[PDB]
Design an enzyme around this catalytic site. Structure first.
Site, PDB file in Angstrom:
ATOM      1  N   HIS A  61       0.841  -1.204   0.000  1.00 17.83           N
ATOM      2  CA  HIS A  61       0.000   0.000   0.000  1.00 17.83           C
ATOM      3  C   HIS A  61       0.868   1.244   0.000  1.00 17.83           C
ATOM      4  CE1 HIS A  61      -3.214  -2.774   1.061  1.00 17.83           C
ATOM      5  NE2 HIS A  61      -2.385  -3.251   1.974  1.00 17.83           N
ATOM      6  N   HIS A  91       5.115   6.586   7.273  1.00 15.88           N
ATOM      7  CA  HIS A  91       4.817   6.229   5.891  1.00 15.88           C
ATOM      8  C   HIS A  91       4.291   7.486   5.200  1.00 15.88           C
ATOM      9  CE1 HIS A  91       1.036   5.833   8.119  1.00 15.88           C
ATOM     10  NE2 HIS A  91       0.497   6.305   7.009  1.00 15.88           N
ATOM     11  N   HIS A  93       1.649   9.122   1.830  1.00 12.12           N
ATOM     12  CA  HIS A  93       0.628   8.982   0.793  1.00 12.12           C
ATOM     13  C   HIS A  93       1.003   9.955  -0.327  1.00 12.12           C
ATOM     14  CE1 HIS A  93      -2.000   6.931   3.777  1.00 12.12           C
ATOM     15  NE2 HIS A  93      -1.329   7.714   4.601  1.00 12.12           N
ATOM     16  N   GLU A 103      -3.692  13.522   1.825  1.00 12.28           N
ATOM     17  CA  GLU A 103      -4.933  13.013   2.355  1.00 12.28           C
ATOM     18  C   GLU A 103      -5.728  14.182   2.932  1.00 12.28           C
ATOM     19  OE1 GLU A 103      -4.102   9.357   4.783  1.00 12.28           O
ATOM     20  OE2 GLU A 103      -4.929   8.521   2.930  1.00 12.28           O
ATOM     21  N   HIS A 116       2.961  10.702   7.418  1.00 13.16           N
ATOM     22  CA  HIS A 116       2.331  10.357   8.686  1.00 13.16           C
ATOM     23  C   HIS A 116       3.300   9.650   9.629  1.00 13.16           C
ATOM     24  CE1 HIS A 116      -1.864  10.335   6.546  1.00 13.16           C
ATOM     25  NE2 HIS A 116      -1.474  11.553   6.874  1.00 13.16           N
ATOM     26  N   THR A 195      -6.453   6.296   8.457  1.00 10.24           N
ATOM     27  CA  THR A 195      -6.966   6.580   7.104  1.00 10.24           C
ATOM     28  C   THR A 195      -6.940   5.376   6.174  1.00 10.24           C
ATOM     29  OG1 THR A 195      -4.863   7.264   6.130  1.00 10.24           O
ATOM     30  CG2 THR A 195      -6.142   8.951   7.296  1.00 10.24           C
TER      31      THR A 195
END
Ligand code: BL0
Ligand code: ZN
Length: 257
Positions: A61, A91, A93, A103, A116, A195
């Site tokens: 992911h 990590h 996004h 996000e 995050h 999330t």
């Protein structure tokens, strides 16, 4: 299982994880003109001096940089937080193009990526117990924009070749997360959730106002990662972000005037 494609993405998650449509879901749009300065907020204390990174994992992911959390080595306290929260992992996004990837959004503005840093409340003994509690977690969120390179990120960028596909991990000891922070710790805070599935509503969100800038070549290397496992057809790891969710009468507070 869950992902970010047309068929397993954010619109599908509620089916296995009903809390997806809960009362304190994340991320949210931060409407800067509705957020209120909160004088009852203590100064934020980010203490990453003694941080003990262990390894980096492509989890199919994103990628996780993991930390040793058996002691109070890297902790978040103050701000909206009571007590001590231990850094467990970080990590990102990110998107397929610079105009999307974050996000959280700021007056509907989408950043190129979002970092995050995930922490658990030490009164609960371990991470697994913390995620059973309304104040079990705190996540520090940092926006990324494309401009100049971020030096503190290059070690991460360097190692991505070694963890191209799902399930691959590499030793990633002695990484200093202090190199990922912007100058200012001005932040917005609100109660929210994870999330990604299981989407548990145990998070105090602390989202920094000041974005960090990363280079075009740094983000390009993020976008070379794979969602798929080794020997499978190539699915570029891009657009692994959940869009903004309903605020639902929650109050976003600002640490700044
Ligand atoms: C088990 N951990 C540390 C996490 N589970 N889901 C995570 C993604 S997020 N966006 O930080 O909620 S982080
Ligand atoms: Zn995240």
């Amino acid at each position: 299982h869950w992902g970010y494609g047309k068929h397993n993405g954010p619109e599908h998650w509620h089916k296995d994880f009903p809390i997806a449509k809960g009362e304190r879901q994340s991320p949210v749009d931060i409407d800067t003109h509705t957020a209120k300065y909160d004088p009852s907020l203590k100064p934020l204390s980010v203490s990453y001096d003694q941080a003990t990174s262990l390894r980096i994992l492509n989890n199919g992911h994103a990628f996780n940089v993991e930390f040793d959390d058996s002691q109070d080595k890297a902790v978040l306290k103050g701000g909206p937080l009571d007590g001590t929260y231990r850094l467990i992992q970080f990590h990102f996004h990110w998107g397929s193009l610079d105009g999307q990837g974050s996000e959280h959004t700021v007056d509907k503005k989408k950043y190129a990526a979002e970092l995050h840093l995930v922490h658990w409340n030490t009164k609960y003994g371990d991470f697994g117990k913390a995620v059973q509690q309304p104040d079990g977690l705190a996540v520090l969120g940092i926006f990324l924009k494309v401009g100049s390179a971020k030096p503190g990120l290059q070690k991460v960028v360097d190692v991505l070749d070694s963890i191209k596909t799902k399930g691959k991990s590499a030793d990633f000891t002695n990484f200093d997360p202090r190199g990922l922070l912007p100058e200012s710790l001005d932040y917005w805070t609100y109660p929210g959730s994870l999330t990604t599935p299981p989407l548990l509503e145990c998070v105090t969100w602390i989202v920094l106002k000041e974005p960090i800038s990363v280079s075009s070549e740094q983000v390009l290397k993020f976008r070379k990662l794979n969602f798929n496992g080794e020997g499978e057809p190539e699915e570029l790891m891009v657009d692994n972000w959940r869009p903004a969710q309903p605020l639902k009468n929650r109050q976003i507070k600002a640490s700044f005037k």
